[PDB]
A = this chain, B = another copy of it.
Amino acid sequence: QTDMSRKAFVFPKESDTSYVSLKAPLTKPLKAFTVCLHFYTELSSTRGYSIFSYATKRQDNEILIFWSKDIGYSFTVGGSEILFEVPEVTVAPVHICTSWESASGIVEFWVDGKPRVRKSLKKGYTVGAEASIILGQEQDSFGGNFEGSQSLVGDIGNVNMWDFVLSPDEINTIYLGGPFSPNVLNWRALKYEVQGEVFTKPQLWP
């Protein structure tokens, strides 16, 4: 386990080879999850990019968080998609927490600790446990077929994942930096492999 606390991955070039792959010894399929992360990039006015990409052998977009140019955050689970529109994008590091629940299909999207409206997606689905998690790229297969025009450029960090929906009060503790214990994927204890041109640096965000 590597403690990545206060560190961030830097993807400083547009490329299809640069990525990191994050391990998840997860034994059971996800009836719900939350994923939170920090990212920073100036691509938001140039083009879309993959922020977080979870894939399984049956489904290359099993969870994906994706900025889509001139729209906002695409959030898609099980290959079906919703949009959270962002009409005035800004150049700053941004903290997103997203969460999804099978029992109701409710999606929550939180940006910088402010909630977006709850939306419905994939009620009754179940996210596969045998999955490849990739940062820095969008993957179109179980572990590859990355597209250079979908790569992230800039920084990502504080990637945390839970197998349950965090309440609003928990998400405030995340954003404000209280203590917490992610039970699927944990930045304090991350297991990962780095590929290509990717660096670990001090985080820019406070």
Contacts and interface: CB of A to CB of B under 8 A. Distances in A.
Interface string A166-200: 01110000000000000000000000000001010
Contact of A117 (B41, B85, B168): B41
Q: Which of A85, A114, A117 has most B Cβ within 10 Å?
A: A117
Copies in the complex: 5
A106 B41 contact: no
A42 interface: yes
A118 interface: yes
Contact of A12 (B85, B106, B201): B106
Contacts of A10: 104, 106, 118
A119 interface: yes
Given A104-B199, A106-B199, 19 more contacts: A12-B104, A12-B118, A12-B119, A13-B120, A40-B117, A42-B85, A42-B116, A42-B117, A91-B116, A104-B201, A115-B204, A117-B153, A117-B154, A118-B155, A118-B201, A120-B197, A167-B202, A168-B202, A169-B202
